[PDB]
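URGENT: need a sanity check before tomorrow's submission.

F., can you look over the Endothiapepsin record below? I want to be sure the sequence and structure line up before it goes out.
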Amino acid sequence: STGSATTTPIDSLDDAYITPVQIGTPAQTLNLDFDTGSSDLWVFSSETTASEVDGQTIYTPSKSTTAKLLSGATWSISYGDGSSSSGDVYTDTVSVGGLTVTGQAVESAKKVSSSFTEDSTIDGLLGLAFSTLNTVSPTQQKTFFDNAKASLDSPVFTADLGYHAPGTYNFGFIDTTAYTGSITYTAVSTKQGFWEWTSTGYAVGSGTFKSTSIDGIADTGTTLLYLPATVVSAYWAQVSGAKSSSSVGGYVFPCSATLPSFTFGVGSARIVIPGDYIDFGPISTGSSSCFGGIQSSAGIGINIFGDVALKAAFVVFNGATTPTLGFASK
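Structure tokens as predicted:
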């Protein structure tokens, strides 16, 4: 089997991407944030505290003939941005892009933090990291990918995120029309439950490439590119008037600037992030200070190749017995 679904930016900045997902029978379509940095499929639901719902579409298990309470199971998750959610668990039929899993754990939110409530466009998350990170207790649950894997034509999914445009998540096949050149594969460590890999270095603009190992994760659920302070300083030093602002919470730059590109290494291959991908616009409405898309990871504990980096590539998440990542230009 295979699946193919379009993923759409939630706003003009590509802050996140939503993908429609069918849950239950008859189908209830929710727009989920596919997150390769977490491993829970959770949704706004008929159980979510009413004051914490503001425009999201909810899953109502009582209206699904295939929903079953997963008795005794609870979940609770906290994300890198300080957001959180928790609740109970149903199993139900879940389809993505024509690929169907029966018996998928669908984590029904009873509580969500303010950032979720305030984002009306995101109806929940669909985690695509390794199932060792799933938070369901007392019986850990599998991701949609892990449950689909054995049925897929190839044990892979691909992320093809757009810049200010829709893109695609494919499951079970690699669309050889969706990228240019060849795919370079690189080793993955699953030790922390993430798609963790080591970049071979970077360049700023037309500068020379610096060969240096940068361990980090491929995370579709993180907007920005978070790298070591040395690398980030080197990038923003090439932008007149850029500075790190403790009041704003990262590097800002004059909105009048033209940003340089940023290149990262994948083995001997190179992925180039155009400068415009690194512009996240005014810090507040009407400001002439703009927020940068490359930020320091120093206060995180991990480097994160988030959407800024991933949307410059066609990315293969190879879930074979020995997982690997692949990157191609596009």
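My own read: Residues 175-330 form a domain with the Cathepsin D, subunit A; domain 1 fold (CATH 2.40.70.10). The CA atoms of residues 171 and 276 lie 29 Å apart. If you see anything odd, call me.
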